[PDB]
UniProtKB/Swiss-Prot annotation, chains A, B:
GO terms for biological process: quinone catabolic process. It comes from Homo sapiens (Human). Changing residue 159 to H: Loss of activity toward CB1954, no effect toward menadione. Homodimer. Zn(2+) binds at residues 171, 175, 220. The modification Phosphoserine is found at residues 77, 194. This is Ribosyldihydronicotinamide dehydrogenase [quinone]. Substrate binds at residues 124-126. GO terms for cellular component: cytosol; extracellular exosome; nucleoplasm. Its EC number is 1.10.5.1. The keyword tRNA-binding does not apply. It is found in: Cytoplasm. One of its GO terms (molecular function) is melatonin binding.
Length: 228, 228
């Protein structure tokens, strides 16, 4: 089995850093092939620009990012930073995203990875999405850490249920590209927690990873995210 | 009245470009004070890094972006690009976000604006969020364009209701910072539409802007976004 960890945290000594490291330790112990894309260390480009296509454009007068990257993918003219990520995804059986929640979503550096790496022709097609998605047969998992407590992330809590913010990521992005979505790993408020509680959350993730290949994906539907 | 348009599109000749320009035209005609932050033209930095603080870090051994930027805001040691955006937001009565929908969310360049500009001490505090957010008294409006049709963005459609993807932006971000949220302007599938239909969508936005100051904000709640 091959795993890609797309990691988005500035500090190796952080709780995010610890979750990424135990995932590497545990999956490596199992004999999996492991690759980590440490976005901040890579100074990963988040902006979707005309620099993402090398050589000449399909329409140089009117720049359309979607059209240009779709054509560049088919013509093998995408920037090397994008194709390097695409090769990692193409080979992966499982893609784990490790990140702190920023504004109920991914940090911009990781949003940039999604915007630029998951181009038409590679991840999805127009038309050719959801179960017609080009990353079918692959698994994806969001391992998120929050500032807010589990209680704040409930239906009647100030932030609403944690499943509400998962919709654009799990459904709009991952499911759209054909991934089977494994249940998210949500590590609530580690900064507020004790050293023992943090060790507990890190151990819970390592223990979950021991049987990750036996898991069934979630039914990635509106009912799962919002229903009763 | 003072308006800030935070604009995220690479192409001035685009439909997004047209929506931004008619907003400038109409608001300027009304006599409003108008400022546009054209993120791609500014090469706006989306990454949340240690480069966003120029002074002595509160903890140089373990970098915590949230803590460091909160302190840097209070000390006036944030990078000038952040400070420049904060001044525009501080003076604005209304903040319009003009952008194409990328993965059920904002393009990464605009996610970066939210991550870096809306720091603790400026946009919110603990306590001092949601109805007590520091941007209370201000209005915010999302003017979004999509690839998907209105029909795809319905409860029984493949993408689910359009309100579902608005939650992290409207509630998790804007309402969290104390903004009152005006109803979104969603311009569905302009690329698929005819030249006449595109003119119609641009005119509908210009027409709506004529009476924008008379609008009441939406009740930015879980019920509004998801029903029941
Ligand atoms: C720019 C920014 C935005 C944040 N937005 C949220 C948010 O929407 N919800 C939340 O619960 N925490 C939010 N947080 C807090 C982080 O999620 C939290 O600090 C992190 O998950 C802790 O993990 P770490 O100790 O490894 O950094 C935000 C933090 C920053 C810096
Ligand atoms: C990286 C990327 C991601 C996109 N994700 C979505 C999406 O989640 N939903 C959608 O309906 N359209 C999506 N689109 C299509 C754009 O929203 C659409 O092309 C744009 O709104 C059209 O406006 P414009 O002609 O001014 O660029 C995406 C486009 C790109 C380039
Ligand atoms: Zn789904
Ligand atoms: Zn709200």
């Amino acid at each position: 089995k091959k795993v890609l960890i797309v990691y988005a945290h500035q500090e190796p000594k952080s709780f995010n850093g610890s979750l990424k490291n135990v995932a590497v330790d545990e999956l490596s112990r199992q004999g999996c092939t492991v690759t980590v894309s440490d976005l901040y260390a890579m100074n990963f480009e988040p902006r979707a620009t005309d620099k993402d296509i090398t050589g000449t454009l399909s329409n140089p007068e009117v720049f359309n990012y979607g059209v240009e990257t779709h054509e560049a993918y088919k013509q093998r003219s995408l920037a090397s930073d994008i194709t390097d990520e695409q090769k990692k995804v193409r080979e992966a059986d499982l893609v784990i995203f490790q990140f702190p929640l920023y504004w109920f979503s991914v940090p911009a550096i990781l949003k940039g990875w999604m915007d630029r790496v998951l181009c038409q022709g590679f991840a999805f097609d127009i038309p050719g999405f959801y179960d017609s998605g080009l990353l079918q047969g692959k698994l994806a998992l969001l391992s998120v850490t929050t500032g807010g407590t589990a209680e704040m992330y409930t239906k009647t809590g100030v932030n609403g249920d944690s499943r509400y913010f998962l919709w654009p990521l799990q459904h709009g992005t991952l499911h759209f590209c054909g991934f089977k979505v494994l249940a998210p790993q949500i590590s609530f408020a580690p900064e507020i927690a004790s050293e023992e509680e943090r060790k507990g959350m890190v151990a819970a993730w390592s223990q979950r990873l021991q049987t990750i290949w036996k898991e069934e994906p979630i039914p990635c539907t509106a009912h799962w995210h919002f229903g009763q």
